[PDB]
């Protein structure tokens, strides 16, 4: 059923968009945030990362992670699939960084720095025109499709709490923050 | 360094139980909603799996989809890989429900559902023991460690927010909702 199917893709479409934006605020927060203990992170990433790729292999980080003398949980296999969450089979920086800092110690100050390179023109309001520009040009100016703003108003349709089709700092922080 | 690793591990440990926790509690609104449109995904997603295996190939997905007269994003493969969150190749029927039951339709009672299996005693509150008996032995009893509530104890510092070490509905539903 085609109905059916519609709003399933459309659905799939909005899991993986939801995905890429926490993932692309964490690494904003890694790039701008200057905060001591992200920069400690960004150091052990360093170490890891022994070839300087920008990614790792599962074997460098359980290498590594064992030369700092830890004992691995024997299930490990399956967390770094887990955090290889683009299935590329390696660990990028990005994903890194979004497991290894945790959501908990995102003080406000740290979402903060997030939001405002999504509220583009700092108004305190995430617009579908900031968020797609952001999403697909990757900075404030250029072409973008009107499919392109309806896919990004659906997703902001999910972390809106106030029915306004914008997301102000509040709602950032109830994604950023489980 | 080490001190830094311990760290670094039980975040991704973290990472990944939450994660767990949540296609859990998709898997058991499935299962006990008795919710209309859950029910026709369910539908769907028998039509999807032709071999009644239970978990379909990306190749399936993508034909299923394609013979309902859909048009799939040429980014289609990658979007695959992120439904496919534990790695395995394949979609199983708990990804297939955690990536098309968009978590902006889960009202009050489709979250309740899932809600009053976690907290197995009915109090209105998950507590670290239910919550690890739940996710580790699958019921309300069994045997676990001190180091199994010890870890789920850290997943519930993520999702609690008045710092009784407890999960309440609201609490709860804030995890379930972006
Ligand atoms: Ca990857
Ligand atoms: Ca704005
Ligand atoms: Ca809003
Ligand atoms: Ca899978
Ligand atoms: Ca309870
Ligand atoms: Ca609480």
Redesign the interface.
């Known amino acids: 059923?085609?109905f059916?199917?519609?709003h399933?893709?459309e659905?799939?479409?909005?899991?993986?968009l939801?995905?890429k934006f926490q993932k692309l605020a964490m690494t904003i927060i890694a790039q701008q945030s200057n905060d001591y203990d992200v920069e400690?992170?960004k150091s052990?990433f360093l170490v890891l990362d022994e070839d300087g790729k920008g990614y790792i292999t599962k074997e460098q980080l359980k290498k590594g992670?064992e030369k700092?003398?830890?004992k691995?949980?024997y299930n490990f296999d399956?967390?770094l699939?887990?955090?290889?969450?683009?299935?590329?089979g390696k660990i990028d920086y990005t994903e890194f960084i979004?497991?290894?800092?945790?959501?908990?110690q995102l003080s406000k100050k740290l979402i903060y720095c997030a939001f405002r390179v999504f509220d583009v023109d700092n108004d305190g309001e995430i617009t579908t025109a900031e968020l797609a520009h952001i999403l697909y040009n990757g900075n404030k100016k250029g072409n973008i499709t009107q499919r392109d703003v309806n896919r990004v108003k659906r997703m902001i349709?999910?972390?809106d709490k106030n029915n306004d089709g914008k997301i102000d700092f509040h709602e950032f922080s109830?994604?950023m923050?489980?």
Chains 1, 2 share one sequence.
């Not at 979004?98 to 908990?104: E, F, G, M, P, Q």
């Open positions: 059923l085609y059916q199917g519609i399933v893709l659905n799939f479409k909005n899991y993986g939801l995905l400690k992170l052990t992670l700092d003398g830890l691995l949980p399956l967390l699939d887990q955090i290889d969450s683009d299935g590329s979004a497991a290894a800092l945790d959501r908990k349709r999910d972390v109830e994604m923050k489980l």
